[PDB]
Amino acid sequence: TEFARSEGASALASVNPLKTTVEEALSRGWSVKSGTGTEDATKKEVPLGVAADANKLGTIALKPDPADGTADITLTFTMGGAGPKNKGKIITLTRTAADGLWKCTSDQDEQFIPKGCSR
């Protein structure tokens, strides 16, 4: 009776909004850094603004950290808090630096991969 479908949706919903945050920072020539806090005007780094553990289904991570837009960026949701079908599975949003485009891939069982995401 695990909520495997809604777990996937919830995980994606915790990282999907961060794409906006990333694009806004890069549009200014600022970097993004993980975690919460204030905009650092010395280093020109914008925090993502979300705690790594905001969603108790798992953890959110940024790579590279910080990221300046000149390399590929990933936002991952690692589902360590999920039930058995999704525990240990990872949803990855990749922004390719060469074209500024985002994709979503997941290593979940294909039945539970959220809309817009591929293997």
Structurally, how many domains does the chain consist of? 1
For residue 110, the 8-state DSSP code is: G
C-alpha torsion sign, points 19, 56, 108, 116: negative
- What is the DSSP track for 40-56? BTTTTEEE--S-TTSST
Type of residue at 20: T
Reported resolution, Å: 1.5
Residue 81 token pair:
């808090």
CB atoms within 10 A of CB 98: 7
Quick one: CA dihedral 9, 10, 13, 14, positive or negative? negative
* Percentages of the chain per state (helix, strand, coil), in multiples of 5: 20, 30, 50
Which of 51, 22, 53, 56 shows the shortest CA–CA distance to 37?
51
Helix (H, G, I), strand (E, B) or coil at 30: coil
Q: Which of 102, 77, 64, 84 is nearest to 13 (CA)?
A: 77
The residue ranges of DSSP E strands in the chain, in sequence order, are 31-33, 45-47, 59-63, 73-78, 90-96, 101-106, 117-118
Task: Assess contact for 69 and 46: CB atoms under 8 A.
Answer: no
Q: What is the CA radius of gyration of the chain?
A: 14
Which CATH number fits the domain that encloses residue 54?
A: 3.30.700.10
For residues 113 and 103, give the distance between their C-alpha atoms in angstroms, rounded to a whole number.
13
Position 63, amino acid: K
Q: Would you state the structure tokens that stand for residue 104, as one six-digit string?
A: 């979503």
The domain of 84 spans: 1-119
CA 30 centroid distance within chain:
18
Calculated CA dihedral for residues 107, 7, 77, 26, nearest 10 degrees: 110
